[PDB]
Amino acid sequence: IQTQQLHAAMADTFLEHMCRLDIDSAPITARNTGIICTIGPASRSVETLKEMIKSGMNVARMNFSHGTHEYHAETIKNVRTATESFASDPILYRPVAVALDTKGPEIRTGLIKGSGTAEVELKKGATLKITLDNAYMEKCDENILWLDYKNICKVVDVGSKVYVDDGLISLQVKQKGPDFLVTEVENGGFLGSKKGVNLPGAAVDLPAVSEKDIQDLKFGVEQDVDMVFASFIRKAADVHEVRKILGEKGKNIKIISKIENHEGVRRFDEILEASDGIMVARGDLGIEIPAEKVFLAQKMIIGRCNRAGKPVICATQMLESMIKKPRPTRAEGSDVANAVLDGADCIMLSGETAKGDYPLEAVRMQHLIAREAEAAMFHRKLFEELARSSSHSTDLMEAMAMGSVEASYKCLAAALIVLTESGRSAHQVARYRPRAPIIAVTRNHQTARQAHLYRGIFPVVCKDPVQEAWAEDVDLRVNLAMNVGKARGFFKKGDVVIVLTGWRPGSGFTNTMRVVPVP
Amino acid sequence: IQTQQLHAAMADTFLEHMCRLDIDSAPITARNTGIICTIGPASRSVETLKEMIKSGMNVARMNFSHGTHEYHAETIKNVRTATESFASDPILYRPVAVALDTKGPEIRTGLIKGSGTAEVELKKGATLKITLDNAYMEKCDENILWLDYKNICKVVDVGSKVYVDDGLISLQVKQKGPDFLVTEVENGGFLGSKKGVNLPGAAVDLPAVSEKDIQDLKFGVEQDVDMVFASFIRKAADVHEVRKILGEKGKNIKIISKIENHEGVRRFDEILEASDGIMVARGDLGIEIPAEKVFLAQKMIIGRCNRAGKPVICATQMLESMIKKPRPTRAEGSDVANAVLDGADCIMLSGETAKGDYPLEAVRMQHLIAREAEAAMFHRKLFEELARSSSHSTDLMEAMAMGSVEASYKCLAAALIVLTESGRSAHQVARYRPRAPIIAVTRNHQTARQAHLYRGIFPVVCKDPVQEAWAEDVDLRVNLAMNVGKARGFFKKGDVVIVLTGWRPGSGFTNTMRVVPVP
Amino acid sequence: IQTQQLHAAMADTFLEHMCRLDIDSAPITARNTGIICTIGPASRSVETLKEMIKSGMNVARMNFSHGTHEYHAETIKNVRTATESFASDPILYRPVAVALDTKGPEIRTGLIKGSGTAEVELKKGATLKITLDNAYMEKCDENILWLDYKNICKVVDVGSKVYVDDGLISLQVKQKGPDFLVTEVENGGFLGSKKGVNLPGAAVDLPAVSEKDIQDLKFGVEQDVDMVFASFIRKAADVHEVRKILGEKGKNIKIISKIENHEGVRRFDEILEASDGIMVARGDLGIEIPAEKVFLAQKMIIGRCNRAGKPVICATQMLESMIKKPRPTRAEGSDVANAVLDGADCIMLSGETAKGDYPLEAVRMQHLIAREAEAAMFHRKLFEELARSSSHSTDLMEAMAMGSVEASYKCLAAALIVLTESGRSAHQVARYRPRAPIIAVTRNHQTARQAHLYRGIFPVVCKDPVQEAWAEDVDLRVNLAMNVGKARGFFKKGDVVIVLTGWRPGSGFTNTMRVVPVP
Ligand SMILES: C[C@H](OP(=O)(O)O)C(=O)O
């Protein structure tokens, strides 16, 4: 029986491709979908980290919706420690990135009847009034509700909706005043103190960045974070703002715009153009838009990204049941397989590794489903479809990407080796979806850390100094990749590999391509 | 902004098709995807049943792995009661089908401490002895465990694994005896009473059809069940026996073989050949085979069925979060939408409706998503694909089917209207996957109940009597469809529908198509 | 308006592509299709010949159906003269090929009324007892007939047709004898003396090669011909015999099997495999088979050759008008251009250049058309189709030929440069149908000559001695192609080009690929 789901790879049609999927067809050793683990209490310890680093973790995410700089600084400190506990061997040394997950702008309610531990009960078809009179700031009750969003009137209109405490409570504006609104509880419940407000369908004035956001980004630039996951991105203008805050010191830091509402969606094109990657925040998204429409947003966002060659991340509730159990639901395993299939660059674990009882087991599972799904894609058709979208482009590095990938399918290469410092060269390739692993060999650490954002890229860091001669230095870097691949089980000695490099030092892109056999 | 993803519909490529999905493209009222519910404690009532018939229920499934014959019989009458409570308006009456889900070759444990209630905390690395000594049948405690599988000893070998309670509890065979097995608790949790045992990687010599099965089978016959779900089918053979046991009185009962294990998958082909339909048994399948490979099975089978034009049901853990929470995950919404997109004729809810606290909420959800996804399919390419797959057949009914579908895509018909008694003429169309709802008008209740099994068919029963003149009889059922369609919200006065009928009485199939406008 | 028919090349569909052809979309300087000219009286002069090379000729063909060796050897000498007349300038030198075209085995009649100039009248419904009696050998009268085809009885059954005078007289064999054939004249004419016969649909016994053919071959061998167009090939065994003859001395001689009949067509695949290439001899073909059907074979013959990677030549009457007019008919323009579209590697001129009044006017026309049709092809589609059909191949060289071809479309390279001594590495790329010219740089003459046989290949001979240092010898050779391209007007300074070279001497194939700019 044929491995790596090859026989399906020859289907002339999509139905036939499906029809040939065989569970007896072994996947390969290598996994291309990156895994982004949320770090916290259950995964914060160093030792835990080493293991998680061992299970398949590639990116440590830091959620700044909480914790103090001191906390994070510590978390961050362990990662690095764990991470580096392996550099002793440049071969078995796997880099790990670091993400700053911005808390961002919010809308909150006042104090209920003065207490912070109080509740009011809101019933269906009830008249609840919302005001901006600073007085009620601590006197919110069931007839009067006070907000912390000055412009709430300008942005909403008659008949719009408000969602208190995260979707739970909903209200329809049945009267529009200048500093108050008159809502009708529609789908009510229990209301508490300082709960989140959502205005689906609206065009929120709210600044790109919160005051807290700022000390958080600064703190990231200081901590040398590889990237930033930016909240509630609504337009391109918003992206420029974080871009500004990062300043010149963190111009290298990647900005991953997070899609959280109607706007982000309806203006996705302008956001993609300005972002460095994109995030499908299924979670917050699911609150702002109807849950049945989430899958729409997720596929469109992914296609669009795939099509444009910008990494896209699928997040939240992937393996949820697993925070408390050792095994995921059938829907969970299917959520994961499909994400990849949709073409996600990388998938993520929130609660699962942050709070959960089975963080390792959660990593391993994602590691597992991904490989299986990665082999069940339809390379031949995706590739064409992809190429046709980029026909308008005659870039040279693209041309080398395309030709390199085609060759990789033709002769069944075991891998694709790429020497690069920026990473663009490898990014270009990944963008084309080889089926085999793209082993990128860089001397720039950061470059190796941010490479994970791409599908297929397995970054290898070269610690050796620059040789006198390009040929030799080029041949050294290559051997490195070959040793690493041989040890990690990606390939044997008779395998065929595709190699991309620069003809001469300082060439511009890998403009050279050879078919070389594993020594 | 367009409706029904008609914009994504014109895409030339899949990727482009995805790139254009739009959260603002409103779906149609109609839901082609069968929704099958598992009746039990939470939804057994009548008032609840009616409520669930209004919400979306099409098929009630009686899980025969439990309860006494007199319990089901009751559940069954309530189903019928509810169903018929709306038979006043031939128009506003929706048929509901009935299924008998078999027990087959299941393995169960004994009583934990004679109580059916009592749980017991299994611990990691502990020792647990499995015996076959019936003294233990009710003394199942944390140190001794009893199974109902006599030859378990002769099929299992050392090192092997044993999975209790939906693969949650994992035990390793550390020692083999003649009546017992020494196992080590490789993965612990709380061991309840009368729980499911899976022996992955073992040859269970249990017969497909067992004595109890037979009663059950015969019982269903008695009850006038529309179809049966044969549990644990592994070979074409197993599917015959059920047929036999079912004999002449139950010839029209439709048999849905359930793919629940490795062998079942392997001999999928022969099994499919002998089956009226098929169900993807996620739960058991996910334990029998690796969790990671399940989604490969789900696609192959659906592909394969779809190709063959045989109903396929996707089942298990689709909406689990909802047994206890009013809201499904983000991963759940996926599953479902993805099952619809994969090409499954019906989706199912087991516990979400049997014990769950939000049984009615579960259905509306599956319904909500189903319409959305439905419009998110890529008709054109699917149509093309389906056609090529069935190239060797020159059948006039297929031929008739293909044209009507093709004509509906083109004029954007609101609905296809079919007149059949056997079901065939409508089954052949649903197989071509029109976008629009297939209103099938029968005079045969059963043909109408089992229609539910098909994607797009919205059965409608003609109570009126056979008019003497053909023309009038035809014109008669067409008006019923019209009214019904008109009454449901599918079409309006200026709408355009496509009508499939017999030229003359005894035509054999629908051999006359007509593009007619809604009156 | 875009050049090279590039708007049309972006069409997603064939209908769109056709719809997008622009009379104002200028072709390129370079012609891809080889032009085969048949040398005779009208162009046997060194002067005319020099003008022909300038004009476009790539291969000179010598029809051995005629002349003596004396003649030919001389015609040959003149071609070699003219060719070398340009050798002064290595950048202007253009290799020319010499092909030997075999008379091939035939069927003749006897004398008519003893007198060689005697012409009898055949009429319809008559009776013609053809005999093998040497008696009649010189007195073939309107009643009796004599043939050289001894086994004609063995080979012809009842009802079978027999053609006399290049199909002018059709005779039906109404009663077979042991050595006579009683035929009733179906379509009668003027039976002349010494006419060639044709046995449509017959399994001719005749020898692969005639006694003459043998002399001719050994001669061809002594004259250093480059390829032999073998006539009347019906099975693989025939090709096999021809090789036997050429022997060891003429091993590097390519053999182009000419498909002149029902059988050869029928057993097409066995011949293709045994041959180095194929020729669609429409002349003979449309005699042996019905004209209405010729196009079918040409399309099939060619579709099949392209699939496999074997040069294919389309012949006879493409521009016959031009024998006596300086301008071809609207119908000949289509023929030439369609053949080009069908995918012919080479195009051919016979009496148009061998006896016509407008020889040069004819080549010129072939060249104008080919450049234009060549732009009109749908490379993206073609490329995909070709790749699919080779899918069962995991050849290192094809892979390389494939990535290259693809990169070429991607960045719109102005050419592909290939360094080769066998010519294989070039053949491979050519098979894949790039849009830009394939400049092949060899140091081997036969290679360079033989290469014209292939589409896209534009052979350049490297006269400069081998360098000691690999890189230098390569770069030298690369420069040459560069200079030449710039000179012939293929590309400028800005232009990109793809270079295929061997990593190391004795690499076996061009395993190195690069995107380089014209200096
Ligand atoms: C990840 C994304 O943002 P978060 O809510 O975690 O801040 C989400 O909503 O899931």
Ligand SMILES: C[C@H](OP(=O)(O)O)C(=O)O
């Ligand atoms: C539905 C199928 O059978 P069950 O386990 O529900 O009896 C399964 O295994 O999920």
Ligand SMILES: C[C@H](OP(=O)(O)O)C(=O)O
């Ligand atoms: C051209 C080809 O061969 P020829 O007749 O030139 O020998 C033909 O049969 O027409």
Ligand SMILES: [K+]
């Ligand atoms: K956050």
Ligand SMILES: [K+]
């Ligand atoms: K069951």
Ligand SMILES: [K+]
């Ligand atoms: K000849």
Ligand SMILES: [Mg+2]
């Ligand atoms: Mg948020």
Ligand SMILES: [Mg+2]
């Ligand atoms: Mg089961």
Ligand SMILES: [Mg+2]
């Ligand atoms: Mg001939």
